[PDB]
Design a protein around this motif. Structure first.
Motif, PDB file in Angstrom:
ATOM      1  N   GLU C 187       0.807  -1.204   0.000  1.00 35.18           N
ATOM      2  CA  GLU C 187       0.000   0.000   0.000  1.00 35.18           C
ATOM      3  C   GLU C 187       0.853   1.272   0.000  1.00 35.18           C
ATOM      4  N   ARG C 188       2.076   1.166   0.506  1.00 33.80           N
ATOM      5  CA  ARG C 188       2.978   2.310   0.521  1.00 33.80           C
ATOM      6  C   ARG C 188       3.352   2.669  -0.921  1.00 33.80           C
ATOM      7  N   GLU C 189       3.520   1.649  -1.756  1.00 32.20           N
ATOM      8  CA  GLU C 189       3.862   1.867  -3.158  1.00 32.20           C
ATOM      9  C   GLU C 189       2.715   2.534  -3.905  1.00 32.20           C
ATOM     10  N   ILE C 190       1.484   2.164  -3.559  1.00 30.20           N
ATOM     11  CA  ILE C 190       0.307   2.743  -4.198  1.00 30.20           C
ATOM     12  C   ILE C 190       0.200   4.221  -3.825  1.00 30.20           C
ATOM     13  N   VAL C 191       0.350   4.515  -2.537  1.00 24.02           N
ATOM     14  CA  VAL C 191       0.264   5.893  -2.061  1.00 24.02           C
ATOM     15  C   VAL C 191       1.398   6.741  -2.641  1.00 24.02           C
ATOM     16  N   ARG C 192       2.567   6.137  -2.831  1.00 22.52           N
ATOM     17  CA  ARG C 192       3.678   6.880  -3.407  1.00 22.52           C
ATOM     18  C   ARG C 192       3.244   7.340  -4.798  1.00 22.52           C
ATOM     19  N   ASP C 193       2.506   6.485  -5.497  1.00 25.35           N
ATOM     20  CA  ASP C 193       2.032   6.823  -6.833  1.00 25.35           C
ATOM     21  C   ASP C 193       0.992   7.942  -6.752  1.00 25.35           C
ATOM     22  N   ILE C 194       0.063   7.827  -5.807  1.00 25.00           N
ATOM     23  CA  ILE C 194      -0.964   8.852  -5.633  1.00 25.00           C
ATOM     24  C   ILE C 194      -0.272  10.187  -5.366  1.00 25.00           C
ATOM     25  N   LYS C 195       0.743  10.140  -4.511  1.00 29.96           N
ATOM     26  CA  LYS C 195       1.510  11.326  -4.148  1.00 29.96           C
ATOM     27  C   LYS C 195       2.139  11.998  -5.364  1.00 29.96           C
ATOM     28  N   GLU C 196       2.842  11.210  -6.168  1.00 30.06           N
ATOM     29  CA  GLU C 196       3.509  11.743  -7.346  1.00 30.06           C
ATOM     30  C   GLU C 196       2.554  12.230  -8.432  1.00 30.06           C
ATOM     31  N   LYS C 220      -9.990  14.810  -6.394  1.00 22.74           N
ATOM     32  CA  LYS C 220      -9.546  14.067  -7.566  1.00 22.74           C
ATOM     33  C   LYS C 220      -9.772  12.592  -7.288  1.00 22.74           C
ATOM     34  N   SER C 221     -10.095  11.838  -8.333  1.00 22.20           N
ATOM     35  CA  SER C 221     -10.325  10.408  -8.187  1.00 22.20           C
ATOM     36  C   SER C 221      -9.068   9.638  -8.557  1.00 22.20           C
ATOM     37  CB  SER C 221     -11.485   9.960  -9.079  1.00 22.20           C
ATOM     38  N   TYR C 222      -8.878   8.496  -7.902  1.00 24.79           N
ATOM     39  CA  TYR C 222      -7.734   7.634  -8.160  1.00 24.79           C
ATOM     40  C   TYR C 222      -8.241   6.196  -8.166  1.00 24.79           C
ATOM     41  N   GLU C 223      -7.924   5.455  -9.221  1.00 23.89           N
ATOM     42  CA  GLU C 223      -8.380   4.074  -9.324  1.00 23.89           C
ATOM     43  C   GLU C 223      -7.318   3.062  -8.916  1.00 23.89           C
ATOM     44  N   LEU C 224      -7.681   2.176  -7.998  1.00 21.56           N
ATOM     45  CA  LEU C 224      -6.777   1.132  -7.532  1.00 21.56           C
ATOM     46  C   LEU C 224      -6.783   0.014  -8.569  1.00 21.56           C
ATOM     47  N   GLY C 226      -9.898  -1.909  -9.338  1.00 15.87           N
ATOM     48  CA  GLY C 226     -11.048  -1.175  -9.835  1.00 15.87           C
ATOM     49  C   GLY C 226     -11.681  -0.153  -8.911  1.00 15.87           C
ATOM     50  N   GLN C 227     -11.460  -0.282  -7.607  1.00 15.68           N
ATOM     51  CA  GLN C 227     -12.046   0.666  -6.662  1.00 15.68           C
ATOM     52  C   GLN C 227     -11.516   2.073  -6.904  1.00 15.68           C
ATOM     53  N   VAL C 228     -12.431   3.029  -7.021  1.00 17.83           N
ATOM     54  CA  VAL C 228     -12.052   4.418  -7.237  1.00 17.83           C
ATOM     55  C   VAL C 228     -12.191   5.165  -5.920  1.00 17.83           C
ATOM     56  N   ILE C 229     -11.098   5.758  -5.457  1.00 12.52           N
ATOM     57  CA  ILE C 229     -11.125   6.496  -4.204  1.00 12.52           C
ATOM     58  C   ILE C 229     -11.003   7.991  -4.463  1.00 12.52           C
ATOM     59  N   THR C 230     -11.313   8.784  -3.445  1.00 15.81           N
ATOM     60  CA  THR C 230     -11.258  10.233  -3.569  1.00 15.81           C
ATOM     61  C   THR C 230     -10.187  10.870  -2.695  1.00 15.81           C
ATOM     62  N   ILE C 231      -9.392  11.752  -3.287  1.00 19.43           N
ATOM     63  CA  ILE C 231      -8.353  12.444  -2.534  1.00 19.43           C
ATOM     64  C   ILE C 231      -8.702  13.934  -2.513  1.00 19.43           C
ATOM     65  N   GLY C 232      -8.925  14.469  -1.314  1.00 17.63           N
ATOM     66  CA  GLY C 232      -9.287  15.871  -1.178  1.00 17.63           C
ATOM     67  C   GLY C 232      -8.178  16.779  -0.684  1.00 17.63           C
ATOM     68  N   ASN C 233      -8.333  17.342   0.513  1.00 14.29           N
ATOM     69  CA  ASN C 233      -7.305  18.235   1.030  1.00 14.29           C
ATOM     70  C   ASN C 233      -5.972  17.519   1.250  1.00 14.29           C
ATOM     71  N   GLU C 234      -5.979  16.187   1.180  1.00 13.86           N
ATOM     72  CA  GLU C 234      -4.746  15.427   1.350  1.00 13.86           C
ATOM     73  C   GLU C 234      -3.777  15.755   0.217  1.00 13.86           C
ATOM     74  N   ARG C 235      -4.317  16.177  -0.925  1.00 12.44           N
ATOM     75  CA  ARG C 235      -3.487  16.516  -2.080  1.00 12.44           C
ATOM     76  C   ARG C 235      -2.417  17.549  -1.749  1.00 12.44           C
ATOM     77  N   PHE C 236      -2.796  18.579  -1.003  1.00 11.72           N
ATOM     78  CA  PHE C 236      -1.851  19.626  -0.651  1.00 11.72           C
ATOM     79  C   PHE C 236      -1.382  19.554   0.804  1.00 11.72           C
ATOM     80  N   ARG C 237      -2.124  18.846   1.651  1.00 14.18           N
ATOM     81  CA  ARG C 237      -1.720  18.716   3.049  1.00 14.18           C
ATOM     82  C   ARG C 237      -0.433  17.896   3.146  1.00 14.18           C
TER      83      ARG C 237
END
Lengths: 93, 59, 354, 90, 123, 171, 65
Positions: C187-196, C220-224, C226-237
């Motif tokens: 999951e750390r690898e997935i989040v690293r991707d979301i981050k970048e 913004k939406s991010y697809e795993l 198939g599950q699509v998750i939402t990233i809000g203020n975390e984008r800049f926080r």
């Protein structure tokens, strides 16, 4: 006479490589002519016809050099057909 | 803003045309945007005169 | 061809001098079973059956046995060349211990039998890539603000910040989990991707937080699977931690650290302010240049001219700077030759690579 | 570039400061570069004597005649008419 | 900034190996950029060039060069980079050098040793 | 009849002004090896007439339109150059011979081959219908012609794109 | 050598005599400014134009003081 006959074919092919015959429901639009195949692109006679065909169903909606024993042009065609679909398939999803 | 930065870029071509600099329209936008980064222009006068020098050795 | 090898805390970049980009990039990891040694992507791919080691975790080499294996991997596996047949330019972290410089030199000449070699500070190479010899520069994976004048880094004014990409990735995992999801496993690898891909530096933290709290305009939406998750203020926080380390429980932000300028002679401070260059993967966040401009302007005298340079290719500016340097006519006389090494030994590196 | 040193001597400033005046100095000097009258140092000399005599300073009118000859004695001055035409005007 | 030097190196490259020359010309860009870095107002440098315009004639052009820098005020480091880098008798003297540079460029080949100016004979 | 005398008259037949007289320029003695090369060389001058008559007959009437002018005034910038070549060739006559002309005038035997056949394909076309009949000469592929006609089109289609940025009208 | 020092003497003389003609005529010039106006007049420049400039810059330095 092998430097010469390479200077002609390098210049007698720029018009062809800047444009398979067309017609006027979609499998009769563009169709391969079997005779006029270079017999060294015969391996990819279906990816060429399939590459431009995808470019037209989107357009109306809104370098290659020859070498012997080296397939730098056979690989160069796959690098464009692999993008020709990713613009149309994404255009329908 | 892109309308302003087009005019300011269009006027700047003429003062580079009557000063008899070989910079055409494309190399100008490259050099203007590169000078816009903050590079010192005293050095760019040397790279262009050398790129044009090694280009002549080919012909 | 001369080789250019950028030794990174998280990723190594390798290639040939003269090229515009590295030919290979791989994880700075070596793994052994819980084929005897695995290095790079393979070690990462098969981490399940291996015990991983990070020999240059924070920019400084801590285990030379595994660092030697990373270099072996670089030559024979990644670049497919014989080191004894090519000069090699290596990069080092700012404030690298003198003894380490000698060790690297000895290993290149005695273990790899390089015909020639040289070692340059990472930050200096990035500055070169921007076409400058003076300015202040680097945020990577595991770890600097480096003032440079006339090609020479000023060690007394260099500052190290143990806050980089790795910390930001873990922080994003933490706040996404607090949001209601669950990212905790390697999951750390997935989040690293979301981050970048979806993170950015807000020009004003509070205003951005207010916007995200009262609307969905920043989501913004991010697809795993198939599950699509939402990233809000975390984008800049997430990247905000670079400016406010307290979010991570750390006691100065990157703008305040860039203190380095104030440690330099007053006569060159204006040159640094006017030439603050960003480099490294962690400086890739959209909006970071404008935020730095705003923050530095607030810290510096009102009469100071502030300019932040953020090259589009800054993620690999270290390597690119090395490619440029190793290709310079005047640099050829600077290589340490095998002859010179045989004549003076490892310590020659201090004189040859000042 | 030499006209800009003048604007920094008369007005005490740096070339980054005074640029409105130097814009007015290029307007006058330029388009008025070529000399408009035939050049002769004889006529300009007989007008600096006639001027120092008019001020009852008849002793300096005969000293100038000894300083104007030395200018010819050394011979490092090409246009002696111009620099005298200017010194007389100021 | 690492790319703006890569696009600059493309424009100055004359169109036709075009894949390795760009790699070597990017060296000449870096080998020459750091020589100056190792080793005065802005508008004044234009006037010193405005003067030299009016002296050799062409007054109104010089009155134009100053007309634009006055409106460009309402960027300073950009113009500092640019400063670094009988009407009938001239007509009959141009169309006469052409006929001297057209009968020469082709008589130097028409009368020579067999096969000098010809490129196909050089194969 | 000396070979130099033929080189004197040919430099005029390239313009229309006539030993060589006026559809082939029949020459009227000399050896057969000379008459044959003159015949082909003299005929190039005849072409220059067909392209000159059009840019003179239609530069007379004022009912040819606005496109028919930018065409009839773009067949002249491609003729001043043909008058610069005749300038250079005449300065050397004071040495060049017949076999030396063939290489000199081998290229302007083509430009005076497209233009002299571009003014016959569009004879009665006025207005936009002419800018559509000098565009049917671009589907040729020949890299030397497709880069010549694709320039005359860039002048002829300037008046058309002047109305557009401002289709048969009825008074 | 010598001919390069004999010229520096014949110039300090003339620049000292022109300073005498300058004071009996009561021009406001001084030794530093006067060496600029002499150099200009050597290249060839209208003294009717150059003196209008000095009569102006001296006329504007008062509005600022």
């Amino acid at each position: 006479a092998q430097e010469l006959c390479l200077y002609l074919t390098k210049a007698a092919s720029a018009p062809y490589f800047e444009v398979v015959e067309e017609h006027e429901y979609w499998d009769q639009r563009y169709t391969i002519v079997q005779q006029q195949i270079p017999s060294f692109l015969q391996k990819m006679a279906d990816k060429i016809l399939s590459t431009g065909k995808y470019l037209n169903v989107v357009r109306e909606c809104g370098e290659i050099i020859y070498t012997l024993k080296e397939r730098a042009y056979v690989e160069q065609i796959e690098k464009a057909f692999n993008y020709a679909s990713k613009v149309l398939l994404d255009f329908l999803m | 803003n892109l309308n302003a930065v087009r005019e300011t870029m269009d006027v700047l071509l003429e003062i580079s045309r009557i000063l008899n600099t070989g910079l055409d329209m494309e190399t100008l936008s490259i050099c203007v945007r590169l000078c816009e980064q903050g590079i010192n222009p005293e050095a760019l006068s040397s790279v262009i005169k050398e790129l044009r020098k090694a280009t002549e050795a080919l012909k | 061809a001369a080789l250019v090898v950028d030794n990174g805390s998280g990723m190594c970049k390798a290639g040939f001098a003269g090229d515009d980009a590295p030919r290979a990039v791989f994880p700075s990891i070596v793994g052994r079973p819980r084929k005897d040694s695995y290095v790079g992507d393979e070690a990462q791919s098969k981490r399940g059956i291996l015990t991983l080691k990070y020999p240059i975790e924070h920019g400084i080499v801590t285990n030379w046995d595994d660092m030697e294996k990373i270099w072996h991997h670089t030559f024979y596996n990644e670049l497919r060349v014989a080191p004894e047949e090519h000069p090699v330019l290596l990069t080092e972290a700012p404030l690298n211990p003198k003894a380490n410089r000698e060790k690297m030199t000895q290993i290149m000449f005695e273990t790899f039998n390089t015909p020639a070699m040289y070692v340059a500070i990472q930050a200096v190479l990035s500055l070169y890539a921007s076409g400058r010899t003076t300015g202040i520069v680097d945020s990577g994976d595991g770890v600097h603000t480096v003032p440079i004048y006339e090609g020479y880094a000023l060690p007394h004014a260099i500052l190290r910040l143990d806050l980089a990409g790795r910390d930001l990735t873990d922080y994003l995992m933490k706040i996404l989990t607090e949001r209601g999801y669950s990212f905790t496993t390697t999951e750390r690898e997935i989040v690293r991707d979301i981050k970048e891909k979806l993170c950015y530096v807000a020009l004003d933290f509070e205003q951005e937080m207010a916007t995200a709290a009262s609307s969905s305009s920043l989501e913004k939406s991010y697809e795993l699977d198939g599950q699509v998750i939402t990233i809000g203020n975390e984008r800049f926080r997430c990247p905000e931690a670079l400016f406010q380390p307290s979010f991570l429980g750390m006691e100065c932000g990157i703008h305040e650290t860039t203190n380095s300028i104030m440690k330099c002679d007053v006569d060159i401070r204006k040159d640094l302010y006017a030439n603050t260059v960003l480099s490294g993967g962690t400086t890739m966040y959209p909006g970071i240049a404008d935020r730095m401009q705003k923050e530095i302007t607030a810290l510096a005298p009102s009469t100071m001219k502030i300019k932040i340079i953020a090259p589009p290719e800054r993620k690999y500016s270290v390597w690119i700077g090395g490619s440029i340097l190793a290709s310079l006519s005047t640099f050829q006389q600077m290589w340490i030759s095998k002859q010179e090494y045989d004549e003076s030994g490892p310590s020659i590196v201090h004189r040859k690579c000042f | 570039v030499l006209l800009q040193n003048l604007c920094c001597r008369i007005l005490g400033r740096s070339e980054a400061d005074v640029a409105q005046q130097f814009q007015y100095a290029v307007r006058v000097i330029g388009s008025n570069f070529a000399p408009t009258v035939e050049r002769d140092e004889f006529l300009v000399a007989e007008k600096i004597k006639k001027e120092l005599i008019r001020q009852r300073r008849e002793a300096d009118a005969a000293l100038f005649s000894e300083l104007h000859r030395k200018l010819h004695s050394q011979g490092v001055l090409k246009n002696k008419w111009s620099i005298l035409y200017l010194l007389l005007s100021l | 900034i690492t790319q703006l030097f890569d696009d600059l190196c493309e424009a100055l490259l004359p169109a036709a190996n075009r894949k390795r020359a760009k790699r070597s010309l990017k060296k000449v860009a870096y080998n020459a950029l750091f020589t100056n870095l190792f080793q005065l107002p802005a508008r004044n440098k234009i006037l010193m060039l405005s003067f030299d315009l009016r002296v050799g004639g062409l007054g109104p052009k010089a009155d134009r060069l100053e007309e634009l820098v006055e409106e460009l005020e309402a960027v300073g480091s950009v113009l500092d980079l640019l400063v670094q880098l009988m009407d009938v008798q001239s007509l009959i003297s141009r169309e006469e050098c052409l006929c001297h540079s057209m009968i020469q460029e082709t008589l130097q080949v028409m009368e020579a040793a067999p096969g000098t100016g010809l490129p196909t004979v050089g194969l | 009849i000396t070979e130099a005398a033929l080189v004197r008259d040919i430099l005029y037949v390239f313009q229309g002004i006539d030993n060589i007289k006026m559809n082939c320029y029949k020459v009227e003695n000399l050896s057969r090896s000379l008459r044959d090369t003159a015949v082909r060389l003299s005929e190039l001058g005849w072409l220059h007439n067909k392209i000159r008559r059009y840019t003179d007959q239609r530069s007379l009437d004022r009912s040819f339109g606005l496109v028919g002018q930018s065409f009839c005034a773009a067949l002249h910038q491609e003729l001043r150059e043909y008058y610069r070549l005749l300038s250079v060739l005449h300065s050397q006559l004071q040495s060049l011979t017949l076999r030396r002309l063939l290489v000199w005038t081998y290229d302007p035997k083509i430009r005076l081959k497209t233009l002299a056949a571009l003014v016959d394909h569009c004879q009665g076309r006025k207005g936009g219908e002419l800018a559509s009949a000098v565009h049917a000469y671009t589907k040729t592929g020949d890299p030397y012609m497709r880069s010549l006609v694709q320039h005359i089109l860039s002048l002829v289609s300037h008046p058309v794109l002047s109305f557009l940025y401002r289709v048969a009208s009825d008074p």
